[PDB]
Design an enzyme around this catalytic site. Structure first.
Site, PDB file in Angstrom:
ATOM      1  N   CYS A  17      14.550 -39.813  46.587  1.00  0.00           N
ATOM      2  CA  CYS A  17      15.881 -39.454  46.017  1.00  0.00           C
ATOM      3  C   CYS A  17      16.329 -40.545  45.041  1.00  0.00           C
ATOM      4  CB  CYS A  17      16.905 -39.328  47.146  1.00  0.00           C
ATOM      5  SG  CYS A  17      16.217 -38.309  48.474  1.00  0.00           S
ATOM      6  N   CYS A  76      17.149 -44.691  49.667  1.00  0.00           N
ATOM      7  CA  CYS A  76      16.023 -43.713  49.728  1.00  0.00           C
ATOM      8  C   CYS A  76      15.062 -43.956  48.563  1.00  0.00           C
ATOM      9  CB  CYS A  76      16.588 -42.293  49.640  1.00  0.00           C
ATOM     10  SG  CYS A  76      15.245 -41.118  49.338  1.00  0.00           S
TER      11      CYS A  76
END
Length: 105
Positions: free
Chosen positions: A35, A32
């Site tokens: 994140c 990600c």
């Protein structure tokens, strides 16, 4: 400093080397992007609080440990002590980590 957890085997030995001091954990996602931009904050605490043990788990490489705490919302932080969960929370609020650390300090 910090320690990358590859599976549950290192997770247990990690709590063993911790002894009885506080032990926070950082469950993020490398695959990600967003994140992942929050890792310079958690890993930064490593040098700001050398009196605390910080771990780093990846829900992709260590999905075995993520399934244990059932992390369905990254990033997420957990507070472990003596090998016993005493606090935990999920949210991209890196600033919250401060007031949280002063919680079980």
């Amino acid at each position: 400093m910090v320690k990358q957890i590859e599976s549950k085997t290192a997770f247990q030995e990690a709590l063993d080397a911790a002894g009885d001091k506080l032990v926070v954990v950082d469950f993020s996602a490398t695959w990600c992007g967003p994140c992942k931009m929050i890792k310079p904050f958690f890993h930064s605490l490593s040098e700001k609080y050398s009196n605390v043990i910080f771990l780093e788990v990846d829900v992709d490489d260590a999905q075995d440990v993520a399934s244990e705490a059932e992390v369905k919302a990254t990033p997420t932080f957990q507070f472990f002590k003596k090998g016993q969960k005493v606090g935990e929370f999920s949210g991209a609020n890196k600033e919250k980590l401060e007031a949280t650390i002063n919680e079980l300090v």
